[PDB]
């Protein structure tokens, strides 16, 4: 799994008439891999320790299942899911 297509799309936006070598594209790809890791690892440190409750969509959806009856829950879980997805 690689970020190269996305990198190349971003490239065509800023510098539409300039290309990029394989070695150069591999440097770009590692760079993004390495920032993602650093951000991800730091983020995890900062979540790990935080013990306070969080309401994500997963909780809201369970709530809808619990509080809306029948037809109403299955159809509410559609509208919500679609909104969250697109």
């Amino acid at each position: 799994e690689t970020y190269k297509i996305y990198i190349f799309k971003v490239l065509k936006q800023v510098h539409p008439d300039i290309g990029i070598s394989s070695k150069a594209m591999g440097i770009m790809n590692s760079f993004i891999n390495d920032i993602f890791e650093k951000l991800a690892q730091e983020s995890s440190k900062l979540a790990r320790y935080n013990k306070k409750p969080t309401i994500t969509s997963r909780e809201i959806q369970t709530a809808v299942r619990l509080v809306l009856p029948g037809e109403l829950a299955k159809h509410a879980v559609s509208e919500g899911t679609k909104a969250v997805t697109k």
Partner: peptide
């Protein structure tokens, strides 16, 4: 968004 911002910053400058 952050990873795109970085990608585009480095790529603008390298171009």
């Amino acid at each position: 968004a952050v990873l795109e911002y970085l990608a585009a910053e480095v790529l603008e400058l390298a171009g």
